[PDB]
Design a protein around this ligand. Sequence first.
Ligand SMILES: Nc1nc2c(ncn2[C@@H]2O[C@H](COP(=O)(O)OP(=O)(O)O)[C@@H](O)[C@H]2O)c(=O)[nH]1
Lengths: 53, 428
Amino acid sequence: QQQQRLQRGLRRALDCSNLSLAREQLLQKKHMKELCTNHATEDYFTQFNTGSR
Amino acid sequence: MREIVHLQAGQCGNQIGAKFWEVISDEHGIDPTGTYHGDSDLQLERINVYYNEATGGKYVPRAVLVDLEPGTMDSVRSGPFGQIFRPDNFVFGQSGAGNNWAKGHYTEGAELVDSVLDVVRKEAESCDCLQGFQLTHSLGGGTGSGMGTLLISKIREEYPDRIMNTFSVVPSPKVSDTVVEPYNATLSVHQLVENTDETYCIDNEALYDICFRTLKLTTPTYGDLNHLVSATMSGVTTCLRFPGQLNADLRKLAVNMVPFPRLHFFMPGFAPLTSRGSQQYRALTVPELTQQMFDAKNMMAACDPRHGRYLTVAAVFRGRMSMKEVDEQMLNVQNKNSSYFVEWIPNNVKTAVCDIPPRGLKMSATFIGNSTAIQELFKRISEQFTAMFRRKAFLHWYTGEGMDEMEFTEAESNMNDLVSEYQQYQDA
Ligand SMILES: Nc1nc2c(ncn2[C@@H]2O[C@H](COP(=O)(O)OP(=O)(O)O)[C@@H](O)[C@H]2O)c(=O)[nH]1
């Protein structure tokens, strides 16, 4: 009976560590959304009409 | 390690090169006086593809700037970046070329050529492992076409394994500058097919409809057309300078788009081109760079591949991005349209991914694509040669310089089998 209670405790410790990693992986995918987004700054637009030939 | 010696010719070539070197020099963080004041360390490790060393952290390009009148490179020196070029690399004559290619193929340009070969063999043998060269010129001129096809021919007979590449500025077919542009442009193509094995087509009316209708400017200029010639041009050499997840040099571009050595005439394009007032409305993701790059409107040739047939395709991608969305859209454009893609080649598209975005952007994309829709470029230039030629119109300019009339007839006829080559890849 003692070993069965210890086994259940080990599985619940596994669950808690998985929960912490799930929150961190949510953070990682929320960061990874903002790299394939494109955005053009004002430097690219000041590249035009600089030479009046 | 993988050097590029950059060759320019003409008024086009001296004012395309002067703007392209404004693109690399701020890409690598080089100020107008030569030195480096960048912010990262990736802007310094592979800089020797284009720049050399000097004293005091000064980097000077491996360019040679060639012309046949001294007035063209007074503006190339008075530019914002005019004082970064080495003073010996400019080559100029005194008498002009006169929009007559044989003046610069036999008489004027044949005595300027042997002082440039003494220059290009000085900047080629300093390369530790030269990848190859690169030419930008106009077939419609006299210097870059009469003599620029002589400069190709004396570096392909001597260095016959390194790459020769050409960002040619072909005559626009609808509205163009000069009347006698057929002779200088038709005749140089037959002496262009042997000695390059990679060539693009940049028509100046295919740059006007982008910078007016797409970029939505008020007064376009030639300064806003050399931004599109150059942003393509750094976008085909960008894995040679910036590390990425799937590299591709300038040699592996050709290997997947020229399957027979007479098939090297592609059609460039460039995807993230948005108007400033219309920039807020745009969605900006991966499949709205593969959306706009494959429109026939975006294309930098004045010829459409709805009439023709995508023989092969390439694309180079910049920016940190996702290999699932890069690799599914390239599949997605290819599966839908069976009639625009050949048989006898299963997969037609090559992929390369760099990491460093262009200046002022996060992501970009560049296109190079082989077609048999570029023999509709050559039939419209070989209908207006032979219309003018069988009435012998402007002929005394050309056949009075020591040039036989049987020499016309070969590039009138044996050029035209290259036209008849491409329609036999309308069959299988
Ligand atoms: N697309 C483009 N065309 C140019 C540029 N500069 C000149 N041209 C075109 O090139 C032609 C003039 O070049 P040209 O002086 O005759 O060449 P060269 O004789 O070899 O010096 C004209 O048709 C112009 O429209 C440029 O920066 N971009």
